[PDB]
Scaffold this active site. Structure first.
Site, PDB file in Angstrom:
ATOM      1  CG  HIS A  41      14.585  73.150  41.130  1.00  0.00           C
ATOM      2  ND1 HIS A  41      15.527  72.171  41.878  1.00  0.00           N
ATOM      3  CD2 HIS A  41      14.409  74.188  41.617  1.00  0.00           C
ATOM      4  CE1 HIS A  41      16.516  72.778  42.613  1.00  0.00           C
ATOM      5  NE2 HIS A  41      15.415  74.239  43.219  1.00  0.00           N
ATOM      6  CG  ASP A  88      17.204  70.297  40.216  1.00  0.00           C
ATOM      7  OD1 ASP A  88      16.797  71.380  39.336  1.00  0.00           O
ATOM      8  OD2 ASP A  88      17.233  70.430  41.508  1.00  0.00           O
ATOM      9  CB  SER A 173      17.575  76.231  44.426  1.00  0.00           C
ATOM     10  OG  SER A 173      16.275  75.071  45.248  1.00  0.00           O
ATOM     11  N   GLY A 174      20.385  75.529  43.709  1.00  0.00           N
ATOM     12  CA  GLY A 174      21.247  76.154  42.309  1.00  0.00           C
ATOM     13  C   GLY A 174      22.380  76.776  42.648  1.00  0.00           C
TER      14      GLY A 174
END
Lengths: 218, 103, 223
Positions: A41, A88, A173-174
């Site tokens: 994402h 994801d 995120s990530g």
């Protein structure tokens, strides 16, 4: 990241900052001299050609000669599902190979199919919001978390900090989730807000994608 | 100028759209999250069309669609409380289209 | 305005362009001058601060004919219903009287229940978008037909013929659209209607506030 602590300088030399127009927006993990691993994402709605992959960083608000900057040559997804936040994970091949040194090192992954049970102690990390009260973090933050299965899905690895309001937040995120020295998670999503104290943070389960990852990086 | 970006948005509830032309202001060259933006969309829905959290929770569908400067679109389900943990640039939003259907 | 033409400059001298600003937001609407000190528009065009431009053709240019007046008062109908877009009418008391001339002058309102029959041809003007992709800098206008009420009753569940007018043929691409809210439905040189709402696609018919249903409140509010 919310309720964490500063990491020691370059304690996690596999940690990567993804930046657009000077701003960190997601984390990532160096998994080979020319491959970075993040959440799908994170690049679903951006100009990938303008993404800068920054390795060897500690304090994003200062100039650091240790840093190594790369562009994203191509990307590899494994069936990302934006609706249900399944799969994801993305792999970004760099326009070159990183120089492996005291500030930049390659992470290590678990074996395919490895599932972690309730109670495993992990470390999360990132440059995301410090709670939005102190704004985004300058110095890479880390947080001691524990793997939980309650209020979660088999398709994610989920972590909680019992007893206080702490967790990952926006901008994380990530970023990797590290358990027993292995990258078992990629930060994916929160529920209701950061550090709710009621819902676990959800990470992409790296170990369920290892086969796929190898076919890209080996 | 250079302090705020003016992002056009529309609201349709039950197939009816008021014919004004409205813009949401975001700090230019700033970063925001899906929690920030979702909360802005919910506040717009309540102030402009009287749509309550209870009406969103009980709607047939309640979404908003982000059109990004690079042309891609992303639909966000306002009935969900899960938010990806990323930041995005305020300058990268071109349009927001909010659509609520009670049945 | 979808499917319209550029107006002849200053042929609709009652037209008002509204710039509405609130904390962290802005809006654009139309409206119409009904007295030297009052502009009629839609209640959903309300905001914290409202700038009124009269005498305009190209609102993106500083034209010598333009008069810029701030709204001293922005009086939404007290029973305006934001959920259903009902009682969608607002009076702007201007901070000063306009300078009345060939480019700025009021438009007449209908009588008590002045007849508006189905099939009547009316003109709607405004600076709203002409498609999903394009707007306009200049005033545009389109001719639309009053419909029988049935044409709106199925598609718009809160449509009330006592307070609203059904306008536009469903098989044409002629309609008011985003930014035309508050502009008048002009029939035989009389403002019978106010652009209010419709389908998000812009396909007709659309719903106008019926001015004659609110004449008492209008009069009470302006005196």
């Amino acid at each position: 990241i919310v309720g964490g602590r500063r990491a020691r300088p370059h304690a996690w030399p596999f940690m990567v900052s993804l930046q657009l127009r000077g701003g960190h927006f997601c984390g990532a993990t160096l998994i080979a001299p020319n491959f970075v691993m993040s959440a799908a994402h994170c690049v679903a709605n951006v100009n990938v050609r303008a993404v800068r992959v920054v390795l060897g960083a500690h304090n994003l608000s200062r100039r650091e000669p240790t840093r190594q900057v790369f562009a994203v040559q191509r990307i590899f997804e494994n069936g990302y599902d934006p609706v249900n936040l399944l799969n994801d994970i993305v792999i970004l091949q760099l326009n070159g190979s990183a120089t492996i040194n005291a500030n930049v090192q390659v992470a290590q992954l678990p074996a395919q199919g490895r599932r972690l049970g309730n109670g495993v102690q992990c470390l999360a990390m990132g440059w995301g919001l410090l709670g939005r009260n102190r704004g985004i973090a300058s110095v890479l933050q880390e947080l001691n978390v524990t793997v939980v299965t309650s209020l979660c899905r088999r398709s994610n690895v989920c972590t909680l900090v019992r007893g206080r309001q702490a967790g990952v937040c926006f901008g994380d995120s990530g970023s990797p989730l590290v358990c027993n020295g292995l990258i078992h998670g990629i930060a994916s999503f929160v529920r209701g807000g950061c550090a709710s104290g009621l819902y676990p943070d959800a990470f992409a389960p790296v170990a369920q994608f290892v086969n796929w990852i190898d076919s890209i990086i080996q | 100028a250079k302090e705020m970006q003016n992002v056009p948005y529309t609201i349709a509830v039950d197939g009816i759209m008021a014919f004004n032309q409205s813009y949401l202001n975001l700090p230019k060259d700033s970063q925001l999250s899906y929690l920030d933006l979702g909360n802005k969309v919910k506040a717009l829905l309540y102030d402009e069309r009287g749509v309550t959290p209870e009406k969103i929770r009980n709607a047939k569908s309640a979404v908003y669609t982000i059109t990004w400067k690079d042309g891609s679109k992303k639909e966000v389900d306002l009935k969900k409380d899960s938010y990806t943990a990323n930041l995005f640039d305020s300058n990268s939003i071109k349009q927001i289209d909010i659509n609520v259907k009670t049945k | 305005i979808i499917g319209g033409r550029e107006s002849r400059p200053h042929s609709r001298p009652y037209m008002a362009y509204l710039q509405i600003q609130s904390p962290a937001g802005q809006s654009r609407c139309g409206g119409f001058l009904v007295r030297e000190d009052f502009v009629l528009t839609a209640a959903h065009c309300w905001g914290s601060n409202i700038n009124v431009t009269l005498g305009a053709h190209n609102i993106q240019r500083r034209e010598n004919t333009q008069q810029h007046i701030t709204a001293r008062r922005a009086i939404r109908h007290p029973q305006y219903n934001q959920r259903t877009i009902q009682n969608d009418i607002m009076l702007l008391q201007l901070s000063r009287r306009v300078r009345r001339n060939r480019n700025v002058n009021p438009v007449a309102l209908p009588r008590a229940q002045e007849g508006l029959r189905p099939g009547t041809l009316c003109t709607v003007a405004g600076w709203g978008r002409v498609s999903m992709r394009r707007g306009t800098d200049t005033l545009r206008e389109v001719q639309l037909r009053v419909q029988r009420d049935r044409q709106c009753l199925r598609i718009f569940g809160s449509y009330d013929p006592r307070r609203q007018i059904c306008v536009g043929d469903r098989r044409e691409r002629k309609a008011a659209f985003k930014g035309d809210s508050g502009g008048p439905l002009l029939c035989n040189n009389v403002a019978h209607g106010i652009v209010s709402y419709g389908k998000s696609s812009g396909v007709p018919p659309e719903v106008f506030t019926r001015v004659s249903s609110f004449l008492p409140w209008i009069r009470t509010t302006m005196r």
